[PDB]
Amino acid sequence: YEMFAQTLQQSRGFGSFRFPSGN
Amino acid sequence: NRPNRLIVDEAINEDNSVVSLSQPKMDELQLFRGDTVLLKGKKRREAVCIVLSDDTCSDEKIRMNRVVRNNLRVRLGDVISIQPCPDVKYGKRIHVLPIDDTVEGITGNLFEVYLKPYFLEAYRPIRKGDIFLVRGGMRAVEFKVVETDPSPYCIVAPDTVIHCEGEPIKREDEEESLNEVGYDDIGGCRKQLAQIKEMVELPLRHPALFKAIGVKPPRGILLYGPPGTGKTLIARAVANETGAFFFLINGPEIMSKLAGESESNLRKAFEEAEKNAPAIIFIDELDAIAPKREKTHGEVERRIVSQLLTLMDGLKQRAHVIVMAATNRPNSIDPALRRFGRFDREVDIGIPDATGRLEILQIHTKNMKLADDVDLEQVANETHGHVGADLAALCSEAALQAIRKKMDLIDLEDETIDAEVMNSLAVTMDDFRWALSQSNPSALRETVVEVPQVTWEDIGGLEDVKRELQELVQYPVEHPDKFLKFGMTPSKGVLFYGPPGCGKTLLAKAIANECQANFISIKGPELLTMWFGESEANVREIFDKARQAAPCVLFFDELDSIAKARGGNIGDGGGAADRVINQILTEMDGMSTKKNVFIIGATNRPDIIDPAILRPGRLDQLIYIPLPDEKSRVAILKANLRKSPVAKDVDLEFLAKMTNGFSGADLTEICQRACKLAIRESIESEIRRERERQTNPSAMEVEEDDPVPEIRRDHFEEAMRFARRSVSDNDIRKYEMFAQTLQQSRGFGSFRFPSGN
Amino acid sequence: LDQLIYIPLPDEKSRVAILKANLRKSPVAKDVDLEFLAKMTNGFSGADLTEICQRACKLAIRESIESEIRRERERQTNPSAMEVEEDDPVPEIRRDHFEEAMRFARRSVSDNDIRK
Amino acid sequence: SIAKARGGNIGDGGGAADRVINQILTEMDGMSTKKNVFIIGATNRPDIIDPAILRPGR
Amino acid sequence: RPNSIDPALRRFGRFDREVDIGIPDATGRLEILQIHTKNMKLADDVDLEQVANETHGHVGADLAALCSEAALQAIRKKMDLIDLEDETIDAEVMNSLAVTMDDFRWALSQSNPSAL
Amino acid sequence: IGVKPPRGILLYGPPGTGKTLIARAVANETGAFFFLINGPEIMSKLAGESESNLRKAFEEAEKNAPAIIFIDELDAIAPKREKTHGEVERRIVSQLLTLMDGLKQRAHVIVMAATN
Ligand SMILES: Nc1ncnc2c1ncn2[C@@H]1O[C@H](COP(=O)(O)OP(=O)(O)OP(O)(O)=S)[C@@H](O)[C@H]1O
Ligand SMILES: Nc1ncnc2c1ncn2[C@@H]1O[C@H](COP(=O)(O)OP(=O)(O)OP(O)(O)=S)[C@@H](O)[C@H]1O
Ligand SMILES: Nc1ncnc2c1ncn2[C@@H]1O[C@H](COP(=O)(O)OP(=O)(O)O)[C@@H](O)[C@H]1O
Ligand SMILES: [Mg+2]
Ligand SMILES: [Mg+2]
């Protein structure tokens, strides 16, 4: 059940998404 | 214990009249670095010198040059009184004479060529009775100060005239020369020379004191290394430093004789060495005399081996005799010579590293005049796998190319000899760049044992991994007392695992740099070579090299190679069985924990590894190394491009945002591809601008004279569309699954001790 | 070899004695309850108990070193007093170290293996 | 040739292991880059080749 | 080793009685250290029993060389005692010198045993 | 000049490529005292006569400096160690190794040798 729970895992590398803030 | 008494120590500075002292001894003696001091030694002979200050100089000892050392009849470890003299004034005339055996080949005037820049601007204090040395012009020549009109302590002023009229005279018979070799002529083996000094000096320098000590000395020292490392040179230098009766024994000279003549030569050698105690006996090429028992066919050679074994055991008479011997490998020796009371102390003279190679080049380029184009440091960085004899031959080849290319200088001296022609010749950088192409080294097959140069700055992120590695490695080295207090056994090994191309080798080299330890790398092809050839007895020979260079980090790269090559845990029916991994486990269980040898493995397929490696007392830590994050990608892109000229218009932080899911090797690939695009643009611009413009030029030269490109935005912008991901998604899911099969716990997170009353 | 002797997983008193025998070298505070510690660990082996003891010891060593470095270097470079005013090693192995090292412990032997 | 002759990446159970290709990889990793010796291979069956040859530095 | 001998020397009326002198254990190593440290003066920091417990796979000649190396490290580190006797001989200087525990802790790192 | 020369040059190739011819041509061009040494002529002699021929050859070449010594078929004199059964041939190999190392006297003597 832990393996099947990890086969539907959230994401990889999208945790640090931020919109750019300029000017 | 009055402070004017000083013990002779070797000086780092190569100036011929400058001594050095420490700061608190000089402050206690109340002197200053501007003072010109006077020294007194044996046989009423003196030396006037300029003293300075130093922090690396020891307190009770004085550092001086070998020129000052041989001009006092004083060796190391002796005593010299010092007297300050503010009465040192200028001279009247200076009359020196050359010495015949150093001017046998040189000719012409030596005054303006050598003596005029020698006394220029240095304000050298000289004395009647001293002998100094001048290098330059592919020759070193010495001059004895014969006659001076004023007081013997005097400073050479530029007003003082120097007289050089007279025949080249011979020396006094008690005087030394450059025929013998000192400690300065040897580079790159400071630790081994220190060990030989510790073993050899204290018994031989003080025979009666050490005899009153009563503790037995060592009496057999076995030097070994690759061919050409200069073992004969080190033995002769230590023999010339201690000044004992040195006698040389050469193996083929004995084995070229008849039957009884070899034994007569050995017995006469040891008798004449025991007469002149203290003495040093050096036996060169020991394996030519005493090889293994299976190889000495015949009776007479086994008889000679037994004669040597008899005389080494009969040497134990407390006769102050030390026997050194050199060989090319410790395995070919008859093992009866390894016993106690015989050749038991072993010194490993390895191949030199880059600092050592730089010191060898500085030693061999003393006399030769040298153009300012060259950079010896870059030469020492480019020579890889070069023993010191290769470096001497390289300097020889560069000098011969420089003399060859000046065929007009061959015309300048057809048969006449001028010192000024050799003074007029220097060596360019392209001579060394040519000599690196016709250099055939002899040490590419050798295992490299050195400290790495990769720091933590080359690696991006991995902070908890950095913390756990320094906790596992650095703490038992620095603080053993805590492990004695709390009473645990420090762990022995670490297995890294993860996707390919993510910096496992860099982490091993980084922690080896952090702890300042040696590093031994063993790749997958060597393990596969041992598996195909069934030569798994070389593993013990690896671990012996690991013990001889302690503290050390032993890195087994691609530990799953034989298991992947066998069937991939599928073919041949067997499971997790191997000759080589078995021998590695035996050697891991064998070794002691006091030696501080730390073992690191690294795999890409952690499922097919042998589970018997992961037991306690072995590689028991498992560390997962994922694909790099965004700040790590920034640091990787910075670390790859330090050598290249990158325009400041390039945004790397935008470049790390697009590349979600790359490894390190992909980023190095795209950087090198942009570099290839830049090189192509530069070459195809230069060819057109030079050749296609005009054949017969309008202007006198090229009007531009400007290299156009650097690496800029459009190169990365073009090289991006060739980049690809090396690691797919299912592969990453496999490593995540194996990481979860070693999960921490379930339900033990809320454990608390009961708190009652 | 004709005698066959089966050696099972250790019982509760055996787990108490294993936890006592592993920790004779280490300075353990007297506030620690080992008899409560053997009740939770139903189904561990000996190697799991040695693992969790050595992990608590690692946590204690890390706390001692990262306290000593800060207290010596970070306090003052040029000292106010003549020497260190504390001159006292702070840690021993205590409750929070076992309490933290418990959540990394795992069972090595599954149920089907025991059934075999 | 040896990979085709062995099993065609099918027989003998093993995968991409060879004495001779191992020695070629060792000699490729050994040599210096200053000598200007350039190595060229050629196959007709690129699927059954050893993947350890296709790494960088090779 | 008993295997390299010509087996005709094993017969009766010849070399038939065999005595096996094995490597010594920890009590034996302690007795060897006590034998070799008779004449040498000795500071009270050291504990020879812990030294005998830590030396594993050491023949008695290794222990004699270890005592030699610790004594030479102790004479080496006192370079002020090298200054105290440049060429004169005093019995009191050798009377004034003892060997610390860290000399033995250093000599265990440069010890290459022969019986692992 | 003072830079050391090379003093041993080893020509090698397949049989019949004309190595003897190249050596004789360079010897006739430079005009130095050329002396020829042939391997089977040495190995056809008795025990002491081979060493006497080698020593007389190098003495008479060192008298007429500058000189070139050519040793044809070097493998007939000095093969591998496993192949030189007997004592006298190993003795001749050691004689050659002695004389090549004793040649370093700055005596303007160059030694060439050919093999297959
Ligand atoms: N580290 C070094 N320092 C100074 N000179 C060196 C060094 N290594 C090599 N050389 C020089 O290279 C030559 C090596 O001479 P040797 O002392 O005979 O070396 P070697 O290790 O004894 O070679 P073998 O084993 O006797 S054939 C000499 O001309 C040395 O001056
Ligand atoms: N490249 C060449 N130029 C001129 N003559 C050659 C050449 N190659 C062979 N020869 C002739 O072929 C013969 C070869 O004689 P050698 O000099 O003895 O050759 P070799 O290589 O010394 O054979 P070995 O090894 O001594 S049996 C002579 O007659 C040469 O003149
Ligand atoms: N933290 C990092 N910083 C910079 N480069 C890295 C980093 N990690 C990996 N690399 C890149 O990876 C390459 C080394 O790969 P490596 O980790 O040795 O592969 P493997 O783990 O298969 O041995 C280097 O060329 C380097 O540029
Ligand atoms: Mg030698
Ligand atoms: Mg011929």
- Ligand 2 contacts (CB < 6 A) are F 15-21, 116
Q: Where are the beta strands (DSSP E) in B549-615?
A: 552-557, 597-603
Q: For B495, phi and psi rounded to 5 degrees?
A: -110, 115
The answer to whether residue C4 sits within a structural domain is no
Query: Token digits for B426?
Result: 């220097």
Ligand lying nearest the CA atom of residue B396? 1
Comparing alpha-carbon positions, the chain B residue that sits nearest to A12 is: B661
H helices present in B158-299, as ranges: 190-205, 207-213, 231-242, 251-255, 259-275
CA-nearest of B409, B423, B412 to B370 is: B423
Q: How far is CA E75 from CA B61, B133, B346, D54, F31, in A?
A: 17, 37, 21, 59, 65
H helices present in B688-746, as ranges: 713-719, 729-741
Q: Indicate which technique resolved this structure.
A: cryo-EM
Ligand lying nearest the CA atom of residue B250? 4
Q: Are C12 and C39 in contact (CB under 8 A)?
A: yes
Strand B279-284 and strand B321-327: the pairing is parallel
For D52, half-sphere exposure in the C-beta direction (CA atoms, 13 angstrom radius) is: 20
Using the Cβ of B397 and the Cβ atoms of chain F, whether some distance falls under 8 Å is answered with no
B730 and B619 in a single domain? The answer is no
Order the strands of the B131-135 sheet from edge to edge: B131-135, B140-148, B93-98, B161-163
Could you say which of B209, B344, B594 has the minimum Cβ distance to residue E108?
A: B594
Q: How far is the CA of B392 from the centre of ligand 1 (A)?
A: 9
Q: Dmax over Cα atoms in chain F, in whole Å?
A: 45
Q: How far is the CA of F68 from the centre of ligand 2 (A)?
A: 20
Last residue of a domain, one of B388, B409, B438: B438
For residue B133, list its beta bridge partners: B142
Order the strands of the B154-155 sheet from edge to edge: B89-90, B154-155, B125-126
Using the Cβ of F108 and the Cβ atoms of chain B, whether some distance falls under 8 Å is answered with no
Instruction: Report d(CA B231, CA B329) in Å as an integer.
Output: 13
B587 and B666 in a single domain? The answer is no
Q: Which helix (H) or strand (E) holds B355?
A: helix B354-364
* CB neighbours of residue B148 within 10 Å: 21
Instruction: Report d(CA F83, CA E15) in Å as an integer.
Output: 39
CATH classification of the domain holding E96: 1.10.8.60
Question: What's the domain count of chain C?
Answer: 1
For residue B555, list its beta bridge partners: B521, B600
CA-nearest of C107, A13, A3, A10 to B737 is: A3
CA-nearest of E101, E111, E100, E21 to E62 is: E111
B637 and B619 in a single domain? The answer is no
Q: How far is CA B308 from CA B252, B289, B334, F95, in A?
A: 15, 9, 11, 21
B456 and B600 in a single domain? The answer is yes
B620 and B634 in a single domain? The answer is no
Q: Which chain E residues are within 8 Å of B480, Cβ to Cβ?
A: 105
B90-111 residues labelled b (16+ CB within 10 A) or e (exposed):
ebeebbbbbbeebeeebeeebe
Q: Which helix (H) or strand (E) holds F109?
A: strand F109-115
Query: Token digits for B154?
Result: 């005097």
Instruction: Report d(CA B547, CA E112) in Å as an integer.
Output: 8
B223 and B141 in a single domain? The answer is no
C26 to B475: CB separation less than 8 angstroms, yes or no: no
Nearest CA to ligand 2 atom 23: F16
* CB neighbours of residue E109 within 10 Å: 12
SS3 content of chain B, % helix, strand, coil (to 5): 40, 15, 40
Give the CA-trace dihedral at B586, B588, B594, B596, to 10 degrees: 150
Instruction: Report d(CA B47, CA B21) in Å as an integer.
Output: 16
Ligand 3 atom at minimum distance from B668 CA: 27
H helices present in B243-299, as ranges: 251-255, 259-275
Instruction: Report d(CA E65, CA E107) in Å as an integer.
Output: 9
Q: How far is the CA of B442 from the centre of ligand 1 (A)?
A: 13
* Long-range Cβ contact pairs of B172-181 (< 8 A, separation 24 or more): B174/B73, B175/B131, B176/B70, B177/B101, B177/B102, B177/B142, B178/B102, B178/B133, B178/B140, B178/B142, B180/B236, B180/B240, B181/B233, B181/B236, B181/B237, B181/B240
Q: For B89, phi and psi rounded to 5 degrees?
A: -120, -175
Q: How far is C34 from chain B (nearest CA, A)?
A: 10
B250 to F91: CB separation less than 8 angstroms, yes or no: no
Q: Are B561 and B528 in contact (CB under 8 A)?
A: yes
Using the Cβ of B418 and the Cβ atoms of chain E, whether some distance falls under 8 Å is answered with no
Radius of gyration of chain A (CA): 15
Q: How far is the CA of F30 from the centre of ligand 5 (A)?
A: 20
Could you say which of B486, B746, B751 has the minimum Cβ distance to residue C40?
A: B751
Is it true that the peptide bond before B278 is cis, omega within 30 degrees of 0?
A: yes
Residue ranges near ligand 5 (ion) with Cβ within 5 Å: F 20, 72
Is any atom of ligand 1 closer than 6 Å to the C-beta of B128?
no
Q: How far is B689 from chain A (nearest CA, A)?
A: 43
Last residue of a domain, one of B314, B331, B348: B348
For residue B494, list its beta bridge partners: B600, B621
Could you say which of C50, C54, C102 has the minimum Cβ distance to residue B748?
A: C102
The answer to whether residue B457 sits within a structural domain is yes
The answer to whether residue B97 sits within a structural domain is yes
Query: Token digits for B653?
Result: 């932080």
Last residue of a domain, one of B178, B210, B234: B178
Interhelix angle for B388-405 vs B354-364, to 10°? 50
Comparing alpha-carbon positions, the chain B residue that sits nearest to E36 is: B215
Nearest CA to ligand 1 atom 8: B388
Q: Which chain E residues are within 8 Å of B57, Cβ to Cβ?
A: none
- Best of B209, B540, B552, B595 to disrupt the E interface (most E CBs within 10 Å) is B209
Instruction: Report d(CA B320, CA B310) in Å as an integer.
Output: 18
DSSP string, F15-78: TTS-HHHHHHHHHHHH--EEEEEEHHHHHTS-HHHHHHHHHHHHHHHHHTSSEEEEEE-GGGTS
Strand B79-84 and strand B18-22: the pairing is unpaired
B553 and B686 in a single domain? The answer is no
Q: Are B558 and B602 in contact (CB under 8 A)?
A: yes
* CB neighbours of residue B281 within 10 Å: 22
Q: Could you tell me which residues come within 8 angstroms of residue F72 by beta carbon, excluding any fewer than 6 positions away?
A: F20, F36, F37, F38, F39, F113, F114
The structure tokens 């080494």 sit at B312
The answer to whether residue C5 sits within a structural domain is no
Using the Cβ of F95 and the Cβ atoms of chain B, whether some distance falls under 8 Å is answered with yes
The answer to whether residue C74 sits within a structural domain is yes
Chain F residues 32-61 with a CB less than 8 Å from chain B: 51
Give the CA-trace dihedral at B578, B581, B583, B587, to 10 degrees: -160
Under DSSP, the state recorded for B489 is P
Instruction: Report d(CA C28, CA C15) in Å as an integer.
Output: 17
For B422, half-sphere exposure in the C-beta direction (CA atoms, 13 angstrom radius) is: 23
Radius of gyration of chain D (CA): 13
How many residues in chain F?
Answer: 116
Q: Are B92 and B162 in contact (CB under 8 A)?
A: no
Q: Are E53 and E47 in contact (CB under 8 A)?
A: no
Under DSSP, the state recorded for B646 is B
Q: How far is CA C26 from CA B303, B487, B662, C33, C65, in A?
A: 60, 5, 46, 15, 17
CATH classification of the domain holding F42: 3.40.50.300
The structure tokens 């002691």 sit at B592
Comparing alpha-carbon positions, the chain B residue that sits nearest to A7 is: B733
> End-to-end CA distance of chain F, in Å?
35
SS3 content of chain D, % helix, strand, coil (to 5): 35, 0, 65
E86-108 residues labelled b (16+ CB within 10 A) or e (exposed):
eeeeeeeebeebebbeebbbbbb
Distance of CA E13 to the CA centre of its chain: 39
Burial (CB count within 10 angstroms: exposed 0-12, middle 13-18, buried 19+), residue B417: exposed
The structure tokens 């592969």 sit at B731
Q: How far is CA B570 from CA B563, B567, B603, B733, in A?
A: 9, 5, 18, 21
Q: Which amino acid is at B104?
A: E
Could you say which of E56, E68, E83 has the minimum Cβ distance to residue B216?
A: E68
Coil, helix or strand for E74? Answer: helix
Q: Where are the beta strands (DSSP E) in B558-695?
A: 597-603, 619-624
Q: Are B578 and B610 in contact (CB under 8 A)?
A: yes
Count CB pairs under 8 A between chains A and B: 18
B584 and B454 in a single domain? The answer is yes
CA-nearest of B199, B198, B220, B216 to B339 is: B220
The answer to whether residue B608 sits within a structural domain is yes
Q: Are D51 and D16 in contact (CB under 8 A)?
A: yes
Instruction: Report d(CA B1, CA F36) in Å as an integer.
Output: 70
The answer to whether residue C3 sits within a structural domain is no
Comparing alpha-carbon positions, the chain E residue that sits nearest to B344 is: E65
Q: Are B46 and B82 in contact (CB under 8 A)?
A: no
Q: How far is the CA of F14 from the centre of ligand 5 (A)?
A: 11
Using the Cβ of F90 and the Cβ atoms of chain B, whether some distance falls under 8 Å is answered with yes
Four-residue CA torsion sign, F83, F87, F89, F90: positive
Q: Could you tell me which residues come within 8 angstroms of residue B284 by beta carbon, excluding any fewer than 6 positions away?
A: B232, B248, B249, B250, B251, B325, B326
Query: Token digits for B298?
Result: 């015949």
Domain extent for E44? 26-110
Q: How far is the CA of B503 from the centre of ligand 3 (A)?
A: 3
